[PDB]
Design a protein around this ligand. Sequence first.
Ligand code: HEM
Ligand SMILES: [Mg+2]
Ligand SMILES: [Mg+2]
Length: 384
Amino acid sequence: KLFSVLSDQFQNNPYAYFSQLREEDPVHYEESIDSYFISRYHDVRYILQHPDIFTTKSLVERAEPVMRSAKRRIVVRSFIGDALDHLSPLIKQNAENLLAPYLERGKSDLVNDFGKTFAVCVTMDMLGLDKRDHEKISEWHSGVADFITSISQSPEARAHSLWCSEQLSQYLMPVIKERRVNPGSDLISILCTSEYMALSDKDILALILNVLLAATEPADKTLALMIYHLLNNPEQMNDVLADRSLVPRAIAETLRYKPPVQLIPRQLSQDTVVGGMEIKKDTIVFCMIGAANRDPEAFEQPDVFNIHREDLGIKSAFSGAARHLAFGSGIHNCVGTAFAKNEIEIVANIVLDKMRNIRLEEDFCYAESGLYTRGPVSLLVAFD
Ligand code: HEM
Ligand SMILES: [Mg+2]
Ligand SMILES: [Mg+2]
């Protein structure tokens, strides 16, 4: 009400405030910006579904601080689509290879020891980049990610964030040149050789930069969240162990329960009616994905993790018509929706295979972090 959704208070537990929010301030104004925060599922869904009214940035336009088209989406989605079938044995090696230094101990941090690196490597194979360079890239990507996600930064952090993109630009630009004339099967090569959008070098760089940011954070977060909540509801865990075809459902319900992307920003092109209030001209609104997925008017007993819930719409959970809104909704939702599913299902399965008797480490302290994107700080697990 006179509360704030950027505060340390909110950032600590966003779910503790969602009910109040859609019940008495469904169009919550913030002081800093200059932006409105929208909590009611119906209002959120309406916005995503209507891009002509609620605009976002183009795929080929750069990163910008979040807080402070011509339809390549299809074309790109088809590419990501032809890709996954030759990439699947590579997602598999990655998983297997990165877990291998931990099996001996019977102890890992799924977030830090495995997740972040895993996600980076998968995106690297998509882009066709040499995985010897995985540490350079994972570092550079955080700089950029931080400059995007953060409210405020220190002079040192901004310095490091600009150094990071300077390095990526200098790293990826000589590759675009290489593959403009000697293409392969990788995503960069396909972007270079069209043949449907005849993109320039600067544009391609921007595009893959966006693919890099998009396809990386949400993957590891999801894996960690799903494993945490499966383990927090150990008898759901046992159902999953006993039938692996449930994994996709476990994924979806995690996406619902605790969406990785917590905010989808949009900007108006026209004075429009949203909920009850009237919002003016061309200012920005934030779709509170977390508020939407917990809405009693969208899901029954919505604050209950349940992978067997009848109103999940599994048949649709990984497309434009998903009931949950973790990928967004409509013709502008996640482009890598089919890819994300396949990835998380594969990793998940390897994890459960090689980590027999997985339990949460004792005195592990579950804690979440981030406003725009959000995941566990750590996930300390013990296994045979
Ligand atoms: C489960 C993991 C993921 C989640 C929760 C997620 C979520 C999202 C969301 C909420 C958006 C904004 C959609 C909108 O504007 O309505 C988005 C955009 C996007 N996603 Fe995903 N995503 C995931 C994984 C991936 C993966 C693995 C890929 C690549 C294969 C990918 C590719 C993209 C791309 C290319 C965009 C466009 C961003 C831009 O236009 O700059 N995503 N994603
Ligand atoms: Mg940050
Ligand atoms: Mg939210």
